[PDB]
Amino acid sequence: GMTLAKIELLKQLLRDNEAKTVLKQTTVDQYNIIRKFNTSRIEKNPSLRMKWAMCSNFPLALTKGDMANRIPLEYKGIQLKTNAEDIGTKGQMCSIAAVTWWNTYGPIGDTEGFERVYESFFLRKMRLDNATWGRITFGPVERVRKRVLLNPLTKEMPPDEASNVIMEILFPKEAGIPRESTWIHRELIKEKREKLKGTMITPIVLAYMLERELVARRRFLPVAGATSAEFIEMLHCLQGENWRQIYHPGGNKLTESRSQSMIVACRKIIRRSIVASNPLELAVEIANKTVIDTEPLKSCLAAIDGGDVACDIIRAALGLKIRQRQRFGRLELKRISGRGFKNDEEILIGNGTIQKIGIWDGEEEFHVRCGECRGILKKSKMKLEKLLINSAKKEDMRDLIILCMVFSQDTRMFQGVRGEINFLNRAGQLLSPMYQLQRYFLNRSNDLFDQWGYEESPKASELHGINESMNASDYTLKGVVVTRNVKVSITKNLSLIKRTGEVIMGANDVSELESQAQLMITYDTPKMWEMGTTKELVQNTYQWVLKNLVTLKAQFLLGKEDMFQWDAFEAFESIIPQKMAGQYSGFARAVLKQMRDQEVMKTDQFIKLLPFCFSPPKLRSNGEPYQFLKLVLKGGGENFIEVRKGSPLFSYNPQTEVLTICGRMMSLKGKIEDEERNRSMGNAVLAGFLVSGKYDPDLGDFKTIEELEKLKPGEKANILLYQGKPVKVVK
Amino acid sequence: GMNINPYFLFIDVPIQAAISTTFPYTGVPPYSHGTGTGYTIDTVIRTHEYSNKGKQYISDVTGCTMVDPTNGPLPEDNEPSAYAQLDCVLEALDRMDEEHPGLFQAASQNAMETLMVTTVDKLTQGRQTFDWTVCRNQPAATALNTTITSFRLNDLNGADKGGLIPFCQDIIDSLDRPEMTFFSVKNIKKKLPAKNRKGFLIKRIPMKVKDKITKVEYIKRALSLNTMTKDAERGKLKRRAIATAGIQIRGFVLVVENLAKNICENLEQSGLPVGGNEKKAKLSNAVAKMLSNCPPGGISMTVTGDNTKWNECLNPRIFLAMTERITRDSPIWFRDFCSIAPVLFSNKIARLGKGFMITSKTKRLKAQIPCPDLFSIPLERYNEETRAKLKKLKPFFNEEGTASLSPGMMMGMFNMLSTVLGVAALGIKNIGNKEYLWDGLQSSDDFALFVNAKDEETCMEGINDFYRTCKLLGINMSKKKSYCNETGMFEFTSMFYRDGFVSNFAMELPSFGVAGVNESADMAIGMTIIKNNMINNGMGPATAQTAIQLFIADYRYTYKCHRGDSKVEGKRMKIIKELWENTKGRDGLLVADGGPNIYNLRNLHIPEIVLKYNLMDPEYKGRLLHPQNPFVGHLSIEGIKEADITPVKKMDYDAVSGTHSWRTKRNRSILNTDQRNMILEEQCYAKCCNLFEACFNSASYRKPVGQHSMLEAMAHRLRMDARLDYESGRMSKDDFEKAMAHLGEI
Amino acid sequence: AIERNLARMSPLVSVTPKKLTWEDLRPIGPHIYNHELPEVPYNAFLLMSDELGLANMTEGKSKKPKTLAKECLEKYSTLRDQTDPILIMKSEKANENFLWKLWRDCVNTISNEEMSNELQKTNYAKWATGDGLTYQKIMKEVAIDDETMCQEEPKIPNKCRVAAWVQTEMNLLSTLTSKRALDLPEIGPDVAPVEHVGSERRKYFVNEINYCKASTVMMKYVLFHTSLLNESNASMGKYKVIPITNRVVNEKGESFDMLYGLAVKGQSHLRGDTDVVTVVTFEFSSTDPRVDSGKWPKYTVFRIGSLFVSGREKSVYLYCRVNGTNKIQMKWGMEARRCLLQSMQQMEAIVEQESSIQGYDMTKACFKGDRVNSPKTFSIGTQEGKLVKGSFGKALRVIFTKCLMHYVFGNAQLEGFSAESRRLLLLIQALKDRKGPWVFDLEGMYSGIEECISNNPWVIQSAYWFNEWLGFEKEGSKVLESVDEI
RNA sequence: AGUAGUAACAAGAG
RNA sequence: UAUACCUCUGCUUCUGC
RNA sequence: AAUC
């Protein structure tokens, strides 16, 4: 036992008066102040100082111990260390040769336990060695900035919880007051104490290695397709702004992680296939050859008893049963009867703020579940009607009631959101309203039960009631009861119909949140880009237009409406908001035909609008099409094309004859008409409108689209093309 | 002939695309030489030049010359105005409170609830701090400990309670103490016996002596800011002065900065404290909104903006008035707590560097004229540049050798709260219901205003209205440096937007060099900086694979550790060549031990020790990863994971702790100097703390808590350790009775 | 209250904005074209274009820095044993005898059989290193009393005009050779497909630079500054002779140990980082210093033999100079290989961007030009007031040269210039993009740019190169884009 | 001398 | 002065938010 | 199908 030596060293220490005064005057708080006391200033230029110091004889300091003494003073003429002591360490200063001498001829220590101590790192090597790689592919990639886990953890905990667990593993006597966490991770502590038993390595090191494999490292990174930590660690080799790399990590993968991916895979198959005709036939084509990391979407949907609306529609579309389940984080549901419809309304909450939430309308019946506890839920628009739950643990019963209360979107629930905790991220991006309401009321539940209200318990033979404390009681929660008793076909347009005639799932019901997937979202067929994002699709289309411009510009002056529709443009239309798709396609087809029929042709404008002409056009009551300044696309305020100017996604430099498409430079030189040199752009800016002369001050100010559309054919007007270029145009 | 021009690339590639080539970061940064007295005095003159038309008065507390520009006459010129009008600042805040409701009182709560939990040790992480006891910039950990021990002599034990709040109460009360006593160490010669022919030896034992100063002298020392020059600051021709404040003010700045930080997080038009990929997103999303928000058939212009004399114009009395309005709902003690730091800065006194070295080229002699002796010599002796400066310093100069800098914010320190005042300018949006609309972004001196309007002639009238607003806040826009254009591309804090924030590899480029921690850490850091730049700084696989070669190149020369097979001569290389010939598993050797570089794009995230572990020889890994080896010795939770990179942000890495994770010698210059006395003072604490850690093994990981005595804790710990070891059987009757006898004496 | 003050405030206070137009952009630096000023002198630490390496073919493996410089001189003994000083050029404040005696003292010391490379503290070496030239510290009370002691006026950088040698340095350093200098070590094997693309990209990117002049100078600078720092810490009190070494490999694959001169490091008791250690250089050269006299006022040049460059003979010279470095600048020498990355990244961005557009690896296309696509071309420079189209490989190296010149002439003048010239570069890019740029105080913006141009060569030449490029971008944009949609 | 460039180093201290 | 052709020192009187 |  060390005990005697510690006390007899304390006797040595207390003999010195200056040391004795320190121990008596310093508090246990103040330890942290006196530990950091030294002469050492902070090194401002460490790269310099190290490069300098390495050229000196004896730059390294050493620890005063028996092992330090086992290093000799010289070896084969080379001085390893000097008798001169270091100020801080009180040990013989040495050269970098001593390090090499130790490693070459020193004592051979105990390496038993090392692999288990530094486990966390060896699994990163395990995830590279066992892994396999796929194809490199060059082409544009949108990369979105989002907070993600940098390294995969053994068991995630808060900073205090992980620390308290660590304390129990390494320093049990000094742990102090036990918490709930003491009990919760008892298996992990028992495992880690048995694993880290035989090792000789210092506690402070061991506690650092636990902290890495318990405490979470979450920071913002640019990502695209893969969000999972086992991918995030490899991110640098997965994707660059202009390339893609397929990667498959080793070991094992999580079941939940496979669903989060699986949803977005379906969600995009549906989001693509809607605009192209025979939506089932395109969705089947893709879905038969989609891949999640290694597993195909067919096998994932078969094995996983989860998914959403989109997953069910594809599950049907391919074949086999459809699990109508909704996972609200902890809660896991299943639909008995009723069919809801989402609606966005401005809902005032308890603290005094109004935030947009997608409210569910109509009456419904669900089969709830929360760990061990079970039940059956009934609700109407913003009201919980019934909750017939079974008896289980207090925490499982309490949280299931909180999950069901939020879910129901009750007006009583929204009034008790007091304590300013809103849903808007630090980086200017809105969090999901409903999920943030769950996390608030799970911890702060006193408002929820108080603002709900109570009533009489059920007086049946099998039915009873429970109060706020989760015990059998007379005054139960208003609409809560504790009882003792525990094929389809698919359309062309992707709606699931019952044998009778009613439609259980609709294509219009799938959620429009095109979020980041968890695992590698691969498409084994060609033309993968068709399931991408706005800037990925926008570019790849315009790249394909310029690729075939020799054919497409010729065939636009021979066949009238043969090449207005093309296999590439179907995908382009899917990122146009379909409430406007026809209106843009009316304008596009009208302005392009104005350059065909008349002599005033513009190749830059042709290439810009040629992708907009797939959709069947939708004109006004007059006959004339809809006129536009910008053609707005799906998601992000920056995403649009401009008619009368250059846009963030599409602009032209006519000096160099070079086109900028989402950043990428594209040479249009040697692919232009010579008569475009001084040809005005007003003759391809409004449909059925051409330039007479230049701005006439008698005509007045520059007239707007609404004003221009409401002019008689043969009326002159003032149009500003791009800033500082006035033009005088007639209908 | 043919004249090659590098600027001719800008025909083929636009400026923003190849902006990396406009940054000369392979080159050497500018450093200062000699004193920074003239640099400081120039700041002192300039600061008072912008306020001299305000209210000049004499402080009855200190006896100093004070100037006050706040609520002063408005400027009739484009020179830097410090004359900020309180009402306009309050109205700007009121608007911000309307646009962001319930924020001020919530943030005031957040910071107040933090304050209670914040310990005294929090002051130890302030780098070099001015120690008022010895008048030197010392380490924050020491500068605190000197201040705690000196307070104890004047009956001030607030630090003993453990909370910051009583220590801050002791600081405001220490001004009231008439004579402030403190320690100063002096040497006594003592005979100690020896085998020294004459059987003894003289040893200069240090001893601490009690030393007093007056109330006013202590007030001035408490209000002192020590000034240097700014070394290694990029992209500037002439050098500038900086400052370091004392331990007293440090406590009160933390809370006022935390308060403003809480506000700056929630504000939509700020790049602080948000950084890295978070700020890259926040600005990118906030651009898209403020772009597409503009009227159709109108104009949206982005003013690429920047302020001038940012620190010199902003008065402390504005910052005082800011806190009061932010804490309006919070209690009277916290309102008074927050009001101190701006009250100190309002009455601050600036120390004047080293002095002025005077010479005679004929005689070949030199001599530093120190700050107090600046006027102990005819002004004709100084050069024309310095002669003008000293004449202008006269009314503000203090006879002790300082200058009272009542206006301005030397150093700055208040970043967040000064950024909030910027955001408050951006929050106005319009004046007189005219046909323009502005909103922007902010990071202290750097702003980026957008203006949406009908035509461009209107836009410029709105930017004038923005300019004339910011004058009333004390925020002076740089007419020279700032410039405007149509929205689409701009610059902000060296981040270049051109329909998207472009990659600028030259900014990070210096960080690719060898770090200067140790062989094990620098390897891990080196491969980490590669990995990271590939992701978010746009390094392709070829350049990344080159950087792997270029790091190892510099590593092998810096640490003198070339491949064992290579015949490059060296002291270490001689043993490295023997290691190569001895060891069988030579691919398992680390580069530091002249091993081969196994690194590549895919495995940059893994530590070299972990990669090669399987291919090492048992004897090699046994020595390399020996548990009781002397090289590492004693670690700390901050030391293993984290390391500095250049405020200086401390990044983290991963590497195994083995023989190459060593430490270097202390700077031995301290041996020659009179500060020898601190060397023993350290080793006295180190002896106590290392013994404390033997009793409490969790003291390394967890910060121990306790207002009780440090000895008391150790005694009780050792008491049970004995008793339980006896009863268990680990200790005998012989040893237990010895142990119980010793603990009785203590 | 804001509006209340805004009303009563004086109209004199305003931004006073003006729309920027191409004619408002006057040429930067009037003085640099003025012929009354002296031409900017060559003031680099070592030689670059003018250097001459004494090639000793070796085994390839490393040896002592004395032993290689010895055997390098053994091969070219004619120059080694040339004792007669045939002086050509002199630096105003130089000592012909001391300098030559120093060179002879070096040559013999490298030639000798002893292990040490130490040079004796002679009467000449003490002049050439500056022994005892530091001033004496005295008591403040004495200096206060002594009426002769005064604060001296500060030394300011002089104003130089444009010099052609910088242009020619750029022209020459950019150009290819048959020799490779770089010491690029091994890496791990390529398993992933991105690593194979990265490897095949390096075979074009790295070996384009490696085979140029600028690559050899860069490597020479580094390897000198690596040993120069090493001697400076270890051998503080000792005056030591260090050779200017580089190992070079040709197209055949044969290691030629080079020697571009010899140098002598002074006494190096370097406390602060900025403390100077004076280093005396002696450098071989084919260039006649009487060609460009204004290039070499800092140098003192002898003539020491002759060498046949191929058939016709070239006279060999010895460029001597008292120079100096410091701990910071020596370190930055060791981190000067990073000049590769800053230029290689920039052009890998083009390869990556062009690979996205075409959908395959557009490396081999950009340099050589494959079946589908022609080679990528860049505006490289001028030919009697006209444009010139250089290839990818050339455009890569012109950027790489600039990154080396950012080091070689890296200082307060370059940093302050580059930053302020950027502001004007961005304003030009607005006029190029037709984004209607406005400015508030252009004269004062110019003032910040123009004050940084004094006596730094790369600053002075880049002020000219700016004004040349400006002239081309002014006539391109103001003609074509002025009248189009009218 | 030279390095440097608004002021230093070209050794300091006992 | 003397020891001192010795001895000690190379970011440790300045380098912040 | 998001939080920390």
Author numbering:
A (entry chain C): 0 to 485, 496 to 740
B (entry chain B): 0 to 645, 650 to 749
C (entry chain A): 238 to 723
What does the article say, verbatim?
This could be due either to 3΄ RNA degradation or a mixture of conformations between the disordered surface configuration (previously observed in form FluB1) or entering the active site. Of the capped primer, only the first few nucleotides (m7GpppAAU) are visible in the electron density bound to the PB2 cap-binding and mid-domains but the expected extension of the primer to base-pair with the 3΄ extremity of the template in the active does not occur in this crystal form. Apart from this, the FluB polymerase structure is essentially identical to that previously described for form B1 (8), notably the base-paired configuration of the distal part of the promoter and the hook conformation of the 5΄ end. The structure shows that flexibility at nucleotide U6 allows the proximal 3΄ end to be either outside the polymerase (as in previous structures) or pass through the template entrance tunnel into the active site cavity. Remarkably, only small side-chain movements (e.g. PB2 Arg40, Lys43; PB1 Met227 and the Motif B loop 409–410) allow the 3΄ end to thread through the narrow template entry tunnel.
Influenza polymerase replicates, via a complementary RNA intermediate (cRNA), and transcribes the eight viral RNA (vRNA) genome segments. One promising target is the heterotrimeric viral RNA-dependent RNA polymerase (with subunits PA, PB1 and PB2), due to its central role in viral replication which occurs in the infected cell nucleus.
